[PDB]
Design a protein around this ligand. Structure first.
Ligand SMILES: *[C@@H]1O[C@H](CO)[C@@H](O[C@@H]2O[C@H](CO)[C@@H](O[C@@H]3O[C@H](CO[C@H]4O[C@H](CO[C@H]5O[C@H](CO)[C@@H](O)[C@H](O)[C@@H]5O)[C@@H](O)[C@H](O)[C@@H]4O)[C@@H](O)[C@H](O[C@H]4O[C@H](CO)[C@@H](O)[C@H](O)[C@@H]4O)[C@@H]3O)[C@H](O)[C@H]2NC(C)=O)[C@H](O)[C@H]1NC(C)=O
Ligand SMILES: *[C@@H]1O[C@H](CO)[C@@H](O[C@@H]2O[C@H](CO)[C@@H](O[C@@H]3O[C@H](CO)[C@@H](O)[C@H](O[C@H]4O[C@H](CO)[C@@H](O)[C@H](O)[C@@H]4O)[C@@H]3O)[C@H](O)[C@H]2NC(C)=O)[C@H](O)[C@H]1NC(C)=O
Ligand SMILES: *[C@@H]1O[C@H](CO)[C@@H](O[C@@H]2O[C@H](CO)[C@@H](O)[C@H](O)[C@H]2NC(C)=O)[C@H](O)[C@H]1NC(C)=O
Ligand SMILES: CC(=O)N[C@@H]1[C@@H](O)[C@H](O)[C@@H](CO)O[C@H]1O
Ligand SMILES: CC(=O)N[C@@H]1[C@@H](O)[C@H](O)[C@@H](CO)O[C@H]1O
Ligand SMILES: *[C@@H]1O[C@H](CO)[C@@H](O)[C@H](O)[C@H]1NC(C)=O
Ligand SMILES: *[C@@H]1O[C@H](CO)[C@@H](O)[C@H](O)[C@H]1NC(C)=O
Lengths: 220, 211, 440
């Protein structure tokens, strides 16, 4: 019955100040505390802070007392994060959570919001640089490197979608500079390096650019 | 302060069976411990609070217990939908989270096929020459890759990626990348990726030479 | 052998249960409470060799009298004027007094009066806290809460004040007191005693600390929940009173605006030169009390330092000490008072603190309803006795804990006083065996 809608997110530029909003729907707004949790990729969850919506009392983590701010509006029952001076490590999935508590103590969390992903980078919309990784020369693998494209997603296929034997398009990795890169691989017989033709089809919908790269010629 | 060390990282079972996850606390937390089920992208759901009490609307096949400074999550009738991440939480003090644990499909032991990929000459013209290692069709998740250039260990300046578990034969595929510049690519002649997996009997290493 | 059943009436045993509690009144009153209910004289007896568990968190009558306070406030505020037609657009320039930035409403507007012919121009005096700025030109202004709720003026001659109230048990229900001195808010008392009704609990409304209350028996007592270290509010009860002196130095001119039989009250003009209202604290009593409180709090926490800061964020009800005195509501800067630290190993000097006062106050637990305080003429002086603190804690880290004031929820203030009592239901029909049959 209760729902925690979240708004704001997507891509934010480096060094800027960002705002997230949440709306609670179906319960007594003054009764429950609200906590703000986040998850970086490849890391466990950690708590930023919490807010009492009744009197606006916040509390913050030790390492982030200077960069955060919480507040709320009681009439539209809306809650807001402000985070100042975004840095590259803040790439995370952000959630609000409702907290169950007694008259004197706080307890487990019950509900989790829909969330709001945040990608921090200062990079323009750009097509992919495509580098044909050389075939291994009974089963031999060949692949390709997609590098420095923004934003997500990217489409990779082989032989115009025909060569599907062991296609493994790995998930996109955000580099330190603020750009995405990944490696796409496929496996063929070792003799087929000398006979079969190879196409790495890369398409980028936001920049809308498509290159069918030659991975075949360095069969050496 | 409090560190919840969840254990192990990965558990494997067939559908319908029983499975058991452990959460080790750094010190005494009384029984202010909860367990949550994490869906594949959606909002996580509360399973168990106060270390033994099943929450409302939760299926009855879930169970949980406390053993002092150790907490146990048991699933009796593990379904196909239940192959997901679960994590342990504590609230005796300031709030901390464990690493979580993925439950995947059990199958037989599968050895990785390993390939090494030199930097492309297009990448040399760009100058961002990076080396690729590939492991294909292995089981389980335990596997480990190291990077050695001129038999010298490289760490930090590398990336890893794992495919999702294959829906047909339950195996896995892992790529790793050693990022370097042109000048960093010039100091060494012999490049190698060293692969250790429980399916393999040894740290099998693939290698190549420059030029 | 030869035992048979027997029944006994008037059995001294009880259970714990919820009930509705009765209340008392006073002879003199403001004039539902003014003449009712009865005003009896209570007596107390000691239950010798009786041990009983108490818990000041789980007990129910705190919520009951919280509802009673809300209901009495609503019934008192019900026969009052609604200030709806004052929500028209205000044009304020605010340059009449010697200094204008202190108060910043001095605001003309149109109001219907006594004919419903056409609205007439009037002007009044207001505080900038109760005034919000509309869009566009800055000289346009609006009342603060009229975008959210209706605002009612309190009639000045029916003003409610901390009249002491006795809570009477109904028939068949008994009240237990726990006269032990070192009661910790939970656990078994071996000093149980019974009354018919409680003493004179006053409806005190205050934030960041409580005042005009009772005093502890031994030294300073600390009450807190013990389910987890993550606590909402920790109550500190003093064994020694400290005196506070509050003052609003200026005199004010009440003016009346006629809207039918109602008569709206506003401020006309401040008399004389402007001075900012302020409060005074005996410095030696305050710092000695803080030292005693910190060195008593480190019993719970073994090896970590103790450090104080004022609260951050939120509305003025938690960033400042807010209370009522006379007919006027005060908000007191407490930044200088709570700046201390201590390592874990009689009336000289006076701290003065600056204040601000505002007329439109929300209900002290709830938004979506607000009331307008009437202006009070003349200078106001107040003296009060502060009896305890309501504190919260930060996380902190190794070697250092951190405690800061809080307590926006008004219910914990009354929970700081009704910790003694508990209500039990009498079960007088215990059966027994005996060595006797019945006549046949
Ligand atoms: C009609 O009625 C309403 C309800 O009664 C009146 O109240 C207004 O409602 C709107 C809509 O909810 C609010 O707008 C929001 O304001 C947020 C903050 O804006 C100002 O307030 C801050 C002061 O409060 C806090 O200050 C600091 C941190 O800022 C804390 O430490 C402190 O404890 C306080 O809690 C100012 O500091 C701040 O700089 C602003 O001046 C906005 O953040 C909020 O979300 C927006 O956030 C981003 C832009 O900042 C962006 O993502 C979006 O635009 C997003 O919308 C939102 O705008 C009003 O604040 C609120 N006014 C109040 C409460 O006084 C309303 O006034 C009334 N209409 C008229 C005409 O009077
Ligand atoms: C805590 O305890 C202290 C100690 O008693 C207490 O201070 C006293 O408060 C009362 C009421 O707030 C004050 O009494 C006022 O005194 C002035 C001067 O004598 C009177 O003019 C006042 O009369 C008002 O009310 C009348 C009836 O409505 C009106 O006709 C009249 O015009 C006034 O508006 C009122 O009786 C008293 O002076 C102080 N001080 C002392 C030393 O008694 C304090 O209020 C308690 N509570 C709190 C929250 O601190
Ligand atoms: C009450 O205690 C405080 C804290 O010890 C005293 O404040 C200190 O006063 C000395 C000089 O008297 C200053 O050098 C310190 O910097 C003050 N510390 C502060 C403000 O934190 C205060 O003087 C004491 N008051 C009385 C009347 O004894
Ligand atoms: C603040 C206010 O009420 N201003 C009005 C003004 O708009 C109107 O033109 C004038 C005519 O009566 O009366 C006054
Ligand atoms: C008997 C005991 O242990 N404690 C007290 C006693 O000191 C006190 O006099 C009495 C009421 O006057 O209440 C009880
Ligand atoms: C009050 O209770 C405490 C709890 O142990 C006890 O130590 C103390 O002696 C009691 N007070 C009296 C006067 O017996
Ligand atoms: C507390 O005292 C220190 C002393 O240097 C001062 O720097 C700080 O601003 C003070 N804080 C408050 C809230 O008064």
């Amino acid at each position: 019955q209760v729902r925690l809608a979240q708004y704001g997110g997507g891509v934010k530029r480096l060094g800027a100040t960002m705002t997230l909003s949440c709306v609670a729907s179906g319960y007594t707004f003054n009764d429950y505390y609200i906590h703000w949790v986040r998850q970086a990729p490849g890391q466990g969850f950690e708590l930023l802070g919490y807010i009492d919506p009744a009197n606006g009392r916040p509390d913050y983590a030790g390492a982030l007392r200077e960069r955060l701010s919480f507040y709320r509006d009681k009439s539209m029952e809306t809650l807001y994060m402000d985070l100042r001076s975004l840095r590259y490590d803040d790439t995370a999935m952000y959630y609000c959570v409702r907290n169950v508590g007694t008259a004197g103590s706080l307890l487990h969390y019950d509900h989790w919001g829909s969330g709001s992903p945040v990608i921090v980078s200062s990079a323009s919309t750009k097509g992919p640089s495509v580098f044909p990784l050389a075939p291994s020369s009974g089963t031999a693998a060949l692949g390709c490197l997609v590098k420095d494209y923004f934003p997500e997603p990217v489409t990779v296929s082989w032989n115009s979608g025909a060569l599907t034997s062991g296609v493994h398009t790995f998930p996109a990795v955000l580099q330190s500079s603020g750009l995405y890169s990944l490696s796409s691989v496929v496996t063929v017989p070792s003799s087929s390096l000398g006979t079969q033709t190879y196409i790495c089809n890369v398409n980028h919908k936001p920049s809308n650019t498509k290159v069918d790269k030659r991975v075949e010629p360095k069969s050496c | 302060e409090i560190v919840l060390t969840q254990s192990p990282a990965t558990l494997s079972a067939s559908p319908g069976e029983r499975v058991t996850l452990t959460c080790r606390a750094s010190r005494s937390v009384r029984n202010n411990v909860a367990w949550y089920q994490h869906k594949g992208g959606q909002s996580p759901r509360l399973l168990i609070y106060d270390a033994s009490t099943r929450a409302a609307g939760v299926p009855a096949r879930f169970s949980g217990s406390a053993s002092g400074t150790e907490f146990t999550l048991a699933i009796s009738n593990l379904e196909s939908e239940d192959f997901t991440v679960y994590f342990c939480l504590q609230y005796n003090n300031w709030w901390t989270f464990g690493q979580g644990t993925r439950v995947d499909i059990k199958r037989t032991v599968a050895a990785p096929s390993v390939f090494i990929f030199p930097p492309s000459d297009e990448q040399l013209k760009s100058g961002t020459a990076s080396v690729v290692c590939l492991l294909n069709n292995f089981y389980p998740r335990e596997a480990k890759v190291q990077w050695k250039v001129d038999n010298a260990l490289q760490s930090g300046n590398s990336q890893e990626s794992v495919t999702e578990q294959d829906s047909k034969d339950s195996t896995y595929s892992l790529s790793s990348t050693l990022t370097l510049s042109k000048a960093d690519y010039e100091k060494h002649k012999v490049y190698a990726c060293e692969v250790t997996h429980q399916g393999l009997s040894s740290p099998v290493t693939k290698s190549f030479n420059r030029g | 052998e030869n035992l048979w059943v027997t029944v006994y009436y008037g059995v001294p045993v009880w259970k714990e249960a919820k009930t509705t509690l009765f209340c008392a009144s006073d002879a003199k009153a403001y004039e539902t409470h003014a003449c009712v209910p009865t005003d009896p004289n209570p007596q107390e007896m000691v239950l010798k060799n009786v041990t009983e568990n108490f818990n000041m968190w789980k007990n129910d009558m705190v919520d009951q009298m919280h509802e009673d306070v809300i209901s009495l406030w609503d019934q008192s505020l019900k026969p009052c004027v609604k200030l709806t037609p004052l929500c028209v657009t205000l044009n304020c320039t605010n340059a009449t007094a010697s200094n204008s930035s202190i108060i910043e409403g001095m605001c003309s507007f149109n109001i219907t009066t006594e004919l419903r012919d056409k609205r007439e121009k009037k002007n009044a005096l207001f505080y900038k806290l109760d005034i919000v700025q509309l869009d566009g030109n800055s000289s346009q202004y609006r009342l603060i809460n009229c975008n959210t709720s209706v605002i009612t003026q309190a009639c000045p001659k029916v003003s409610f004040d901390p009249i002491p109230i006795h809570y009477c048990a109904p028939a068949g229900y008994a009240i237990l007191k726990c006269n032990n001195k070192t009661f910790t808010g939970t656990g078994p008392c071996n000093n149980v005693s019974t009354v018919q009704c409680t003493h004179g609990i006053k409806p005190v409304v205050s934030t960041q600390l409580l005042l005009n209350g009772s005093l502890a028996e031994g030294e300073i007592i600390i009450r807190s929940e013990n389910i987890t270290k993550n606590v909402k509010t920790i109550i500190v009860h003093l064994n020694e009173s400290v005196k506070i002196e509050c003052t609003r130095p200026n005199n004010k001119t009440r003016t009346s605006i006629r809207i039918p039989g109602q008569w709206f009250y506003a401020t006309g003009q401040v008399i004389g030169d402007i001075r900012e209202a302020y409060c005074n604290i005996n410095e030696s009593k305050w710092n000695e009390t803080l030292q005693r409180v910190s060195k008593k709090l480190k019993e719970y926490f073994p090896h970590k330092n103790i450090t104080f800061q004022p609260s951050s964020g939120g509305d003025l009800e938690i960033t400042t000490h807010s209370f009522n005195c006379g007919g006027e509501f005060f908000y007191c800067n407490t930044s200088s008072l709570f700046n201390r630290t201590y390592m874990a190993n009689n009336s000289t000097r006076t701290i003065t603190i600056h204040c601000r006062i505002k007329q439109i106050i929300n209900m002290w637990q709830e938004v979506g309803r607000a009331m307008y305080a009437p202006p009070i003429a003349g200078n106001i002086t107040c003296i009060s006795n502060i009896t305890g603190l309501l504190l919260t804690r930060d996380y902190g880290k190794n070697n250092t804990e951190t405690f800061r004031p809080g307590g926006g929820n008004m219910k914990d203030n009354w929970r700081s006083e009704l910790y003694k009592y508990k209500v039990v239901k009498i079960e007088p029909l215990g059966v027994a065996p005996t060595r006797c049959k019945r006549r046949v």
